[PDB]
Structures are given as C-alpha cells and as structure tokens.
C-alpha cells in the first residue's frame, strides 16, 4: 500500500533496490527482494513477514532486533499505540505469614510488528526480550495465540 507515510524514505537498510536492470528482462516488478531473518528458539517466521511490504526496524523478523533473554507471555490489553501494544501479565504472589497468595499483575508495553495482522484484545502473545526499543518497551511480540472464545 502506502509504505512511504513518514517524511523520510522507508526501506530495509540491507536491501539495495537501485540495481540497474534492462527493461526487456522484467518479470513482475524490477527488483525488490525482502529482507527477513529467522529468529531462534524455534519460532516460525510469519508468512506476512516474508511476503509483506511494511517497513519496521523494530520487527523481530524483518528489522534490526535480536531476541535474547527472557521469553514471556501475556494477554493483549490495549492496542491504542502505533506498532505497540500493552499486555497484562497476571501472577500469584505468595505471602508466607498467611500461607496464601494474592493476585498481582504487571502491564508491559511490547512492540507489535505489522506482520501480526488481526491481533485482538485478550489473546495470548509470546514476547521475547530485546534491547530497549523506547522508554518503556523492551519486548517484541514473537507469537500470537488467539483467545479461546474467538471464532
């Protein structure tokens, strides 16, 4: 679509799109191979990442983000930011005096690559730790599992 929405040109820094090609040797568009990498830890590169046109330098698959550290999960709580969502991690904290637990939660802002189209509120996301991407963001969505009630 309209990839060039910013004031600066948007492109994958590792893909050279200005190679000289003669006109008569054209099959489809002239030349635009798409850069992507397979992240480790058994995660599958989304098909939209391989055959997409979006430009996201913070994408785990087509961007400049290396996933290393903790692999966590959460439920999507808010999706009101650009390429960023807020997930909620619920857990039980043990108070030893009463030998009991209490519900606590942490809100975590994670980068959502546009390769995960159709991500709802309430479905599980597996996020991986990366370098600080902004003031509060340090995790990238690596997998999206749909909610149980989602048809």
């Amino acid at each position: 679509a309209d990839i060039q929405t910013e004031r600066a040109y948007q492109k994958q820094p590792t893909i050279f799109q200005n190679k000289k090609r003669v006109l008569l040797g054209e099959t489809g568009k002239e030349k635009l191979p798409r850069y992507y990498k397979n992240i480790g830890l058994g995660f599958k590169t989304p098909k939209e990442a391989i055959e997409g046109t979006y430009i996201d330098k913070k994408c785990p698959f087509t961007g400049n983000v290396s996933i290393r550290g903790r692999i966590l999960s959460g439920v999507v709580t808010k999706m009101k930011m650009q390429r960023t969502i807020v997930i909620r991690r619920d857990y039980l904290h043990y108070i030893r005096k009463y030998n009991r637990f209490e519900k606590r939660h942490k809100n975590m802002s994670v980068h959502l690559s546009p390769c995960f189209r159709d991500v709802q509120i309430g479905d599980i996301v597996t996020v991986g730790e990366c370098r600080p991407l902004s003031k509060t963001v340090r995790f990238n969505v690596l997998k999206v599992t749909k909610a149980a009630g989602t048809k």
Binding site: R7, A8, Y9, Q17, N18, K19, K20, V22, K135
Partner: protein
C-alpha cells in the same frame, strides 16, 4: 554541559522521580555539531575510554557512491535541500545524517564517459570542449572497441538521473554522521527513493 541520564524523566506511570545522586561524567552530553557547508574544519573530541571523535564543524567535500554503477567518488557538497527531521536544518544548511544534499556530478560524469564511451549531461548544441573528445573516442583496437560496445548495451541511465546530470548536480543522501566521524559520506539518490525525495522537495518549496 548537558546530561543524558534517564532518571530525570517521569516514570511510566507519570509520577515524579527523585534523583539519588548528582550528575555522573559518563551520563554527559556535548553540544551538537551543527556541521555547516564550508571549507573543512574538524575539532577532535576526547571521548570515554581515551578514544577520539571527529566533530566536523565545516565540510565542503564528501565521499558519495553511485550504487547502480558502483562508482564512489570524492565530491564537493553544494547545498542542503531536504531534511526529514527539521525544516530549519535546511534553512541553516546543516549537514546531518540522512539529510538530502546536492553534490557535484562531475566525477561521476567523468567516470561514466571514460567507462561507457558515452556522453552524459552534455548539451547537444555544444561540440565538446578541447582535449576531451579523445577520451570519448580515442584510437582503440578491435578488442577494446568491442569491449566498449558490449558495455554500451548496459549504459542506459534513468531519465531522472540524466536530467540531474544535465543540471550538473546530483541528489544524494548523507549516510555517515558528520558530528561523530568528521565525514559527510553518502550515496546518490536513485530509483523510487529519488522519486520520493523529489516529490518531497517540490512539495516543500
């Protein structure tokens, strides 16, 4: 003498943070190198670890690459025409990374003429200046002539680049950071990137 700490900022919740220590030297920042276009002037900066940064205050010349032809040349930088960050940087003609500049096309024109034996950016009314029709034509044997003829099949240059060569100055993007390395290196704009930046420049002016 500015700072670069993250603890003077509000927390994610928006609450105020209390500084538990005074500014540290490793959190320091330095004034921006507003790299102008002019006769070369670079001030070496002593940085953490004892290393050196090259704070370019003035640069009139850079190293720019024609990617399709793989022709890298040293070239005078003429003007700053577009800045995606701040339009003011164009008004002050500041060299920063990713700023769009006008570079002299003469070195790439010379390489093209000496490589393809084809004129480029040359007005049809003129009949070449003295002492350069030789490098264009020369006295070559059958082997050299057939080599240049084989090169001629891939010598077509896109119309946008051709028009720029007629005007004598090419559009380029600065890809190095002049305030950190003292250099304004970059690449000539081509293809859809050139189309986008021409559209942006003409929309701005």
């Amino acid at each position: 003498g500015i700072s670069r700490d993250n603890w003077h900022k509000r927390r994610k919740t928006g609450g105020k943070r209390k500084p538990y220590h005074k500014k540290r030297k490793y959190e320091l920042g330095r004034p921006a190198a507003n790299t102008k276009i002019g006769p070369r002037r670079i001030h070496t900066v002593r940085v953490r670890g004892g290393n050196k940064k090259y704070r370019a205050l003035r640069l009139d010349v850079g190293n720019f690459s024609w990617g399709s032809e793989c022709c890298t040349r040293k070239t005078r930088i003429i003007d700053v025409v577009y800045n995606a960050s701040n339009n003011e940087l164009v008004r002050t003609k500041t060299l920063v990374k990713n700023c769009i500049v006008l570079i002299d096309s003469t070195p790439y024109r010379q390489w093209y003429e000496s490589h393809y034996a084809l004129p480029l950016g040359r007005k049809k009314g003129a009949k070449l200046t003295p002492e350069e029709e030789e490098i264009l034509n020369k006295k070559r044997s059958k082997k050299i002539q057939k080599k240049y003829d084989e090169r001629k099949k891939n010598a077509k240059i896109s119309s946008l680049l051709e028009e720029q060569f007629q005007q004598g100055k090419l559009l380029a993007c600065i890809a190095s950071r002049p305030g950190q390395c003292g250099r304004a290196d970059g690449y000539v704009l081509e293809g859809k990137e050139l189309e986008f930046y021409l559209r942006k420049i003409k929309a701005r002016k």
